[PDB]
Structure formats: C-alpha cells, structure tokens
Amino acid sequence: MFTEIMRYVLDLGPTVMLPIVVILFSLLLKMKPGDAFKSGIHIGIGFVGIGLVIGLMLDSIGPAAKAMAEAFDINLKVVDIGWPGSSPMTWASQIALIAIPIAIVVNLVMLMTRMTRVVNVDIWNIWHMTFTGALVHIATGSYALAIVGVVVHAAFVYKLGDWFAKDTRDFFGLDGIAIPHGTSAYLGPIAVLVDTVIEKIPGLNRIHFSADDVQKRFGAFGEPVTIGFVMGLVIGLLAGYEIKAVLQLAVKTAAVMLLMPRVIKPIMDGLTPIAKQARSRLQAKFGGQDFLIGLDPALLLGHTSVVSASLIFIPLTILIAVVTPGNQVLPFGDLATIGFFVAMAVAVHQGNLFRTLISGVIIMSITLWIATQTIGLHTQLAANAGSLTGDGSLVASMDQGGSPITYLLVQALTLENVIGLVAIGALYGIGIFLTWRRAKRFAAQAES
Amino acid sequence: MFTEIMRYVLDLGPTVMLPIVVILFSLLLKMKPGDAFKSGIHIGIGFVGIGLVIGLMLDSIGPAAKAMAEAFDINLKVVDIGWPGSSPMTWASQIALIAIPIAIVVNLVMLMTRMTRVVNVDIWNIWHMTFTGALVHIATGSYALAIVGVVVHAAFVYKLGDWFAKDTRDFFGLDGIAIPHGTSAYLGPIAVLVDTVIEKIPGLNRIHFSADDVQKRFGAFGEPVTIGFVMGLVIGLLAGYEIKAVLQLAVKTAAVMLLMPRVIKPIMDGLTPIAKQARSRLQAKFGGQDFLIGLDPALLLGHTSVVSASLIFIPLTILIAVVTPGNQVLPFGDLATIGFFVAMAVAVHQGNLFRTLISGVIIMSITLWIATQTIGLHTQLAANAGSLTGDGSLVASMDQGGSPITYLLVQALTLENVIGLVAIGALYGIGIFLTWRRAKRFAAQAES
C-alpha cells in the first residue's frame, strides 16, 4: 500500500503536493479556508515559476557550459552527470521510497525533542538522503547501515537548515524559511570555516568586494542584470557559440537573474500569512522560537549575488577541475546550476565576492576530489538503477557524488581510505563546529 | 545577401534583435548609453519571460485543450493547426522574406505622411501580413496581387494599432505601446461592432459582469489566481485527465495568470524612459501625439481578465465549432492561446465579461466559418511549404486562416463567393468604421 501512495505523492510534485501540505497546515492553524487556499496556490505558482526559470537555466546555460567544458582540452574522462542525472538514478534505488518516511520520521522525532525547528515539507529533495543511503548500501553492503546513513544525513541537513536560518532570513530575505536541502546547505560549513580562517588572517580580511561595489564602480553597467548579461556573453564566447547564440544566451542569463526573484516572490507572499499565524499560535503553544519551513534550495537563486556567482563559477569550476590534484571528474551536468554549491557561501560572507570566490574555489576543489573518490560507488549505483550505458563508462556526479556527508559516512563505515577520511573529516568537522558555534552566537545575540 | 541578413535577424528574434533596435532608438534620442542598454536588456528579459510563460501555456493548456477536442464526439475532420503551425508554414513561403522590407517601408511611408503613429518594431509578427499575401498569391496567382495584399494588411494593422491605442494605454496599462499584430488587433472591430449593437439594445446594455464583480461575489476565491485554478480544473476534468494531471494543469494555469504580468513588467520598465524621452524630444520635433511602439500581442495576456477569457473560451470555442453552421475546422492548435482572439474584445468592453462573451462567441463563429472557407487555400499553402502530410489531409487554422482580412482580400480579388464576401465585408467594414469613429472620438475627448 505504501509504495504506490509514495509514488503518487512524489509524482504530484512541489507544484501540487506542496500547496496541499501548506493548505493542510493552514487549516490546522485555524485560518479561513479562502486564505489557506490562496496561500497554497500562491506557493504552487511560485514553484511552477521556479521550475520554469530553472528549466531555462538548464536548457540555456546547461548546453553552453557543457560545450565550454568539452571545448577546453582536458584529460578528465569521467563526466559529471550532476543532479539532473543523479536524482532520477537515486529515485530508482531500492531504498528510494522508504527514505521519505524515514526522513519524515526523523524530522518529527527531532521536532518533538526540540532538537530542530525546521519543518521540512520539500520531500522531493529527500533524494539527497536517499543518495547517501544508497551509496552506504553499495559500499558496506548492509541494509541497516543504509538506513543509518539516511537517518544521519537527514538529521544533519535539518540541523544545517536550523543553523543557516539567520542567513536565509537576513541575507536572502526568506523570513521563516529554512533551506536544509541541496548542496548549499551541506557545503555551507566549508564556507564558514573559510570565512573564519580569512578573518583570522590580517590583510585578507580587509579585502571587500560586493555586488554593490561593482554597481558603484561601473554606474548603470553595474546593475545585476548587466552583470548577468556580460557573464552570459563570456560563457557564450568561451563555449564556441556563434554571435547570435552568444547574444541569445546572454539575454537568457540576464533574464534568469531578473526573473528568479520575481518567480520566488509568490512563495514568500503565500507563506507570510502562514508564518504569521504559526508564530502567533503554534510558537506560543510550544514555546521557543518560530518554526521554519524547509524548502527547495532553488529559493537561494533569488539573490542576485547567488546568480552572479553561479555564472562566474562555471569557467572557474572547469579551471578548478583541471587544477585539482587527483581529479578525474569533468563538471558537466552540475555546471548549469553551479550556484547551488556556493549559494550559502555568498550568504556566509555577506555577499563578499572575494571571500565568496575563495570559499567557492575550496568547495569546488573538495567536491571534485570527493566525486573522484566516489566514482566507483556512483558507477555501481548507475548499474543498479539500470542507467549505465553499454560500454560501462564510469559514472560520477558533483551534486551528490561529491557530497562530504556521503563520503564521510562511507569512509567511516568502510575505512577504505583512512588518510582521506581523516583529512576531509577534520575539515568538515571543524566547519560544522564553527557553523554551530556561529548559529549559537547569532541566536544569543538575537535573544539579548 | 538580403535573404541571409533577413533570416539572420529573424533567427536573432525578439529576445536579441528587439533590444538592439531599442538601444539604437534610444541612442538616436541622445540618451546615455548606460540607460539605453539597460532599457534594451530589460525589454529582452521581458520577452524571454513572455516566451517562457507562453511555452508553459502551449505545453500545459495546449495538450489539455486538444484532449478536450478529441474527447467530445465531433464531425470536424479538419484540425486547426493554429499559429504554432501557421507561422512556420508562413515563414517558408516565397514572399516570406520580402514581406519584412515591404511592411517596414509601408510603416515608414505612413509615418512620414502622418497617417499613423505606430512605430512597429515586432517584425516577427509580420508573418501575419506574409500569410495574407501568400493566400492572395495562391488564390489569384499574381505576385503583384500578393504584394498588394501584404501592403493592405500592413497598413490596416498599423491603423488598428493606432485606433486601439487608447485601449492598450488605459485598459492594459501599456502606455506608449500599440499592439497592431495578432488576432486581437484585427478582431477588435468585431468587438466594437458588437459593443455598439449591445449598447443600442435596451436591457442588455445594463447587464454588467466583470472580474471585480466575481471577486466581490466570492472573496479570496474571487481572486484572479483562484479563477485560473478553477478554470484549469475544469479544463483538466473535461479533457479526461487524471486527478494528478488535473491538479498539475490547474496550478499551471493559475501560474500562467499570476506570472504573465510579472514577466511583462520588465518590458514596461525598459520602455518607460524611452517613451518619456521620445515624447520630450521627438514628439515636439515632429508635432502631433506621442508615437507608439508596436509589439507582440502577448503583451495583452498580462491582464487577468484576458487570461480568464482565454481559459473560459476553450470549451466555448469547441462548443461554437460544433454549433457553427457550415464549419469543418476543429479548433486544435489555437486553443492554448485562444485569448489572443478576444484580448481586444475584453478591452473594448471595459472587461465586461458578458459583453466579452458575446463578442467572443461572434468572433469565434466568424473565424471558424472563415477557416472553413480558406481550408483549400491553407492546404495549398501547406503543400507549397512542404509541411503537408503524405495522406494529403486538409489543413486549416484559426489564427490566420480565419482572419477576416485575408478572406476579404481573397474574395475581393477572386470573387469566389459573392454572398459570403458581401456579408463578411459589410460586417467588417461596419466594424472598421465604428472603431475608427470610436478612436477619433476618444482622441477628440483627450484633446478637449
């Protein structure tokens, strides 16, 4: 019974199921049915528009970035299929369906114990937890260890959405919204560690370069739209595109950056009365701070600095992949939405594109090395899901193949690479401790 | 050379070429290059967003409406390919490329003689004039007569955009923008005639029903978004779609209605400083009223009443096609954007949905009868363009096959159907005279 119900709910999508969940929550909050329905349909509309602009990204910058990647003479044989290739592969796994109830049960358990405030409703990003569990299952060979990996990933991402709540509220303006999923949430700790290290270092901490600085320096050509147009021009030129294709891609990138906030605005409009009623009634009933709603990481693309970093980092990601030692993954499928990796890095640095560039370089290097490490597990995952081609080419990805959580869990439960496990674990544990202390300090400051 | 450059500009398309023309106009107005470029890229972004939402319409309500057309047991063998099928067919015509310089020369000649104020820049809708000329060429067999038809259609549509300038400025809020192209512009005279007849008739003129009336009647459920959601539900239910498909389509239609104005807003934001500079300098230099910029009829989809009529008229269009005497065309491809037919009908009636419904029924009946009349010419056009299938099935369309201009010109130059020509010519000439007198009266009132 459970299987087809979960499949139906997943197939409904964020467009339909998420408004249904929001309407149910609003009705449970004793709101008028008209307002509840209006908020629900507004959230559905916002997610439809998000899908439209994300498809525009994947269909315009996607092929352009891939053409740029192949254009440069490279020795990276394995291609990064990205989340467009990882997510269908992950949803075809054995534990794919049970991951949704496992993640929801974990979220509920941590909510009742007041270990988190993130009420995750975006169940279509539980394919990340599913990916972690599937790779653990492939490596160790134990179903119980796969479930343990799913539970650990879910708890970690909920706590990350809790810790980066201040950044989404202040920098991104998504008040009452957490972003626990995506690469941004679990690559944020690396950004926090880099920011702390830079602040410790004299001289480098003084270097500041925000998008507002670009605007003030370049006048009317420093607007976010002009930056997106110029970045699209650069991408098209590097990709070997013709002048017509270059200009069309440039206008499409500028349109992406102008239209992400516009299509994300309906979600905020729908959720604002819901959040107000929640903080009025449920927060008072249960005490503590207001509960956050966990949503898609595509909301982070509303910020213009995030889209600017997304456009800038495509050539930077390819250059990093060439530079990074012991890397065999060529970033192919994740290049279209490479801003997901550095979305939280921008927020941590308050939009400082210098610090953002440093953190993004570190993050991309780490993710590419981790993807190189998990090439074998990802190929086995493709073979299990049936997506492996006849030639048996190696499969690797950066959205989830390069996730530090998955690699750390696999190494901890297998110990196949002691030195790499120690290094990545030390770096990520320091990042986690730093981001937890940072969130605790921000909460203390807000309370005072 | 000329063919190559014309094809290159057409392939550049509204996304790129229109910003280039706008930037050139702004530079000719002695504006700063930064503001000129910002306006141009904003217009390009607006047109990218318009294309995104139009693609959403054609990919969600398109197949749903086609499934509705199949679902009802009908005897209309010939299917309406619509403008998605007519425009590629038209651009493959012999006169397709020369139509652009012919239309631009006609526009310039009428501008210098002060016969119009519409500066048409949307050259990708010159395929309407091309369609008229191609059908005239097929019927009469004379190249000169085809050129005459193209010239007549171009002059007529520029004058229509001039006459419906008040409706675009006031009802749609597109100040300083004319909409001379599309089915809305040349089906507006029928709406004007219907409105005049209704106003003459006592009792019926007192009946008023607007979207605001629905909003006041219902509440949060009278919101335009709720109307779009309900209409999507109805379309999905009638199409035989499953509940998941029904709900996804409903949210997509509501998203269309909420997102069309948002993606149209960049065009207005970009064009406002240009219009201000134009009315400041060029209008004073050349006297008269401010010149209007002719753009895509998709700008008329920003209004929520227009999208509501678009959604409502799909089942109405199918019912009319069944009812209409001597009709053999089943509305298939134009159903997704059937609001283009009544976009100006809404504006003429000040959003009165009862009057809009009457005008739309009359307009759809007329267009379906005309498409039935021009089935043969459209089939010959398909054979000429090579798009005709092997079985030689009849081809007809409603976007341009059913245009009263094309049918009137063909009948005037061929005298194939004397009675039908007389009837349609009398009706359309009365509509043209009424809309010209209406525009003249509005201009006189504004002057006073």
mmCIF file of C-alpha atoms in Angstrom, chain B residues 54 57 164 166-174 179-192 260 264 295-311 313 334 337-353 355-357 359-361 363-364 367 399 438:
data_model
loop_
_atom_site.group_PDB
_atom_site.id
_atom_site.type_symbol
_atom_site.label_atom_id
_atom_site.label_comp_id
_atom_site.label_asym_id
_atom_site.label_seq_id
_atom_site.Cartn_x
_atom_site.Cartn_y
_atom_site.Cartn_z
ATOM 1 C CA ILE B 54 3.744 31.266 -23.451
ATOM 2 C CA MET B 57 0.683 27.783 -21.867
ATOM 3 C CA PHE B 164 -6.771 50.657 -30.288
ATOM 4 C CA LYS B 166 -6.497 54.068 -26.093
ATOM 5 C CA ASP B 167 -7.466 50.544 -25.048
ATOM 6 C CA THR B 168 -3.853 49.410 -24.704
ATOM 7 C CA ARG B 169 -2.912 52.550 -22.777
ATOM 8 C CA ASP B 170 -5.886 52.585 -20.394
ATOM 9 C CA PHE B 171 -7.212 49.040 -20.034
ATOM 10 C CA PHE B 172 -3.927 47.163 -20.378
ATOM 11 C CA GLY B 173 -1.743 49.903 -18.924
ATOM 12 C CA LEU B 174 0.801 49.618 -21.752
ATOM 13 C CA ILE B 179 -0.495 46.176 -30.470
ATOM 14 C CA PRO B 180 -1.086 46.132 -34.239
ATOM 15 C CA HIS B 181 -0.367 42.432 -34.752
ATOM 16 C CA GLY B 182 -2.096 39.237 -33.721
ATOM 17 C CA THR B 183 -5.706 38.172 -33.947
ATOM 18 C CA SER B 184 -6.693 40.642 -31.225
ATOM 19 C CA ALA B 185 -5.916 43.714 -33.312
ATOM 20 C CA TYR B 186 -7.897 42.672 -36.383
ATOM 21 C CA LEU B 187 -10.750 41.058 -34.470
ATOM 22 C CA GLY B 188 -11.216 44.165 -32.326
ATOM 23 C CA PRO B 189 -13.517 45.823 -34.886
ATOM 24 C CA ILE B 190 -15.986 42.950 -34.498
ATOM 25 C CA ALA B 191 -15.928 43.509 -30.741
ATOM 26 C CA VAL B 192 -16.526 47.231 -31.279
ATOM 27 C CA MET B 260 2.223 36.828 -17.200
ATOM 28 C CA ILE B 264 5.596 41.645 -18.904
ATOM 29 C CA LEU B 295 4.866 44.963 -30.010
ATOM 30 C CA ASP B 296 3.764 41.362 -29.616
ATOM 31 C CA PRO B 297 0.094 40.634 -28.852
ATOM 32 C CA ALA B 298 1.407 38.539 -25.957
ATOM 33 C CA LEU B 299 1.558 41.806 -24.011
ATOM 34 C CA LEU B 300 -2.242 41.663 -23.868
ATOM 35 C CA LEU B 301 -2.007 38.452 -21.827
ATOM 36 C CA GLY B 302 -0.763 40.443 -18.840
ATOM 37 C CA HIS B 303 -4.317 41.403 -17.939
ATOM 38 C CA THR B 304 -6.035 38.868 -15.710
ATOM 39 C CA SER B 305 -9.363 39.337 -17.498
ATOM 40 C CA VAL B 306 -7.710 38.357 -20.781
ATOM 41 C CA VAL B 307 -6.286 35.162 -19.280
ATOM 42 C CA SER B 308 -9.654 34.416 -17.681
ATOM 43 C CA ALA B 309 -11.328 34.778 -21.076
ATOM 44 C CA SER B 310 -8.597 32.624 -22.628
ATOM 45 C CA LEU B 311 -9.288 29.828 -20.163
ATOM 46 C CA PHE B 313 -13.224 30.227 -24.159
ATOM 47 C CA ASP B 334 -5.117 27.894 -31.291
ATOM 48 C CA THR B 337 -3.802 30.849 -26.685
ATOM 49 C CA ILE B 338 -7.456 31.392 -27.587
ATOM 50 C CA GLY B 339 -7.299 34.561 -25.501
ATOM 51 C CA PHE B 340 -5.483 36.285 -28.347
ATOM 52 C CA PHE B 341 -8.760 36.270 -30.274
ATOM 53 C CA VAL B 342 -10.635 38.107 -27.509
ATOM 54 C CA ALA B 343 -7.768 40.087 -25.981
ATOM 55 C CA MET B 344 -9.017 43.319 -27.542
ATOM 56 C CA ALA B 345 -12.645 42.267 -27.062
ATOM 57 C CA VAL B 346 -12.113 42.475 -23.303
ATOM 58 C CA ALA B 347 -10.559 45.932 -23.605
ATOM 59 C CA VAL B 348 -13.347 47.281 -25.811
ATOM 60 C CA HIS B 349 -15.997 46.211 -23.286
ATOM 61 C CA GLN B 350 -14.003 47.540 -20.301
ATOM 62 C CA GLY B 351 -13.699 43.995 -19.003
ATOM 63 C CA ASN B 352 -17.446 43.302 -19.066
ATOM 64 C CA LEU B 353 -17.386 39.508 -19.204
ATOM 65 C CA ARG B 355 -20.248 41.565 -23.416
ATOM 66 C CA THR B 356 -16.859 39.884 -23.791
ATOM 67 C CA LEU B 357 -18.583 36.504 -24.006
ATOM 68 C CA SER B 359 -18.210 39.319 -28.714
ATOM 69 C CA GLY B 360 -16.024 36.243 -28.346
ATOM 70 C CA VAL B 361 -18.806 33.932 -29.491
ATOM 71 C CA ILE B 363 -15.633 36.340 -33.214
ATOM 72 C CA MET B 364 -15.073 32.593 -32.884
ATOM 73 C CA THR B 367 -13.192 32.887 -37.563
ATOM 74 C CA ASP B 399 -5.097 32.263 -36.105
ATOM 75 C CA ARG B 438 -14.536 55.474 -31.692
#
